[PDB]
């Protein structure tokens, strides 16, 4: 316990049917939000309190709209409560589910590719657009201290030169998840894969999501080619160069996100610097 | 030579009063019979349509297509196109550099915008290049049995790619269809010409890219570099489609070779080597 325990009980009893009590409340990991697992008599619930500083990062009204909008696709787990004023959301917790990792993900291509095809060709108009260069400027002005990363102004300029390349290649605007870390995929006992945690989801080019999938799980070149044969279709075209560019933009943006989050109280060790350095490496190989 | 005579006869109407034919030599070439006529002030390519090629190429469409493609300024000047005589006469670019599989690798910045120009031309060429239909076409034209080993099984494998292409999406654009490096000619004034449009037809642009890569044996790094010059919002690129079209080209042109050899040509090992590269491609693709 206890006051956090009290709040969590104070906030999920309205979901508890006649004759039901909370057995235990456990803290979970997580990067964006303050997460808990509430175990009850009948079932378990994921409780997510909006993380430190995230109000500037995520439009929570947009997120709520997007959760409702995407429900019929059946990709995510259920949301039981989404209460913006209280700063809380409660999701279904899938029992005996397996959370994917960078190793186990390599065995699930035939399940992941159709999930991504589903969202990318859904025609869903999400509230909010992910404009990568605008996002960089966003994190720049949110960060109070100077950005700690070496040679930033020059790296930033090299990164911004990619905007013209993207415009020349053509940028698509489709519903995207935006954050394809392997832990966002869970497999239930029946063998059904779910894609969870849509809080960053926004309109973007689908090559962003492919880049994220590949980067976050460190796909090999062969693995990328094999995944792409699962994914590529008339309705889901693939540009390899766009993927390479979005990998650089992602490392750039999330390294900045890390600086912001760490000013808001977090500590992610070397997460931020490692991503930044990978962006620099990506730039050198690209250019 | 009676050859001398008919050549003089044909380009006669192009020459003036004391303008004369200095010499005539035989050129290389795989589809037609080609000759260089050197005259007082101009040099001309004289092309006699190859034996049996009327079955392969619609010459009336080719003439039409020539006219339609003129305002793009890609080809050299055509002076004569006589279907009845079975002859065309083009300008021969003096002291031009004919590109080869080596020199083509230094010309990406000139080639990519040529291919962008044709592929985004919005022009409706007469003739559609449907590769699986083209395979069936060659099979019907070939009189003896196709000599290639295990052909039925290989053909089966090749035809299994029709459905893959349909699932990837097939575009329909004006294409050159025959991008051997020798079809690129560099003038001493600096411009690159793309010549010999006789196979040009509506097709997926990934076919032209596959032909360019395959005929000059691009390395994968060279392909990637080339695609950096070519890829754009208007000219999107699919790596898998390029790989499939390479297999299709090797198959089709191996059959073209059997057909041509039945007309009396001898291309040495060209046919079997292309067929076997399709076999190799199919193995590497699966
Ligand atoms: C959003 N990050 C990519 C920074 C990790 C969160 O899943
Ligand atoms: C048409 N081939 C590809 C067989 C060679 C002619 O350029």
Numbering used by the authors:
A (entry chain A): -2 to 284
B (entry chain B): -1 to 284
List passages from the publication reporting this PDB structure.
In the complex structure of LicA-choline, a molecule of choline is located at the active site of the C-terminal domain, whereas in the complex structure of LicA-AMP-MES, an AMP molecule and an MES molecule occupy the active site. In the LicA-choline structure, four aromatic residues, Tyr197, Trp251, Trp254 and Tyr268 together with Val178 form a hydrophobic pocket to accommodate the quaternary amine moiety of choline. Glu213 at the rim of the pocket makes a charge charge interaction with the positively charged quaternary amine of choline. In addition, residues Thr29 (mediated by a water molecule) and Asp176 form two hydrogen bonds with the hydroxyl moiety of choline. Superposition of the LicA-choline complex structure against the apo-LicA structure revealed an RMSD of 0.4 Å over 278 Cα atoms indicating slight conformational changes of the overall structure. However, drastic differences were found in the active site. Upon the binding of the substrate choline, Thr29 forms a water-mediated hydrogen bond with choline, resulting in a shift of the P-loop about 4 Å towards the choline molecule. The residue Asn30 in the P-loop also moves to the active site and makes a hydrogen bond with Glu196 to further stabilize the P-loop. Therefore, the active-site pocket undergoes a change from an open to a closed conformation upon choline binding. In addition, mutation of the choline-binding residue Thr29 to alanine decreased the relative activity to about 10% of the wild-type.
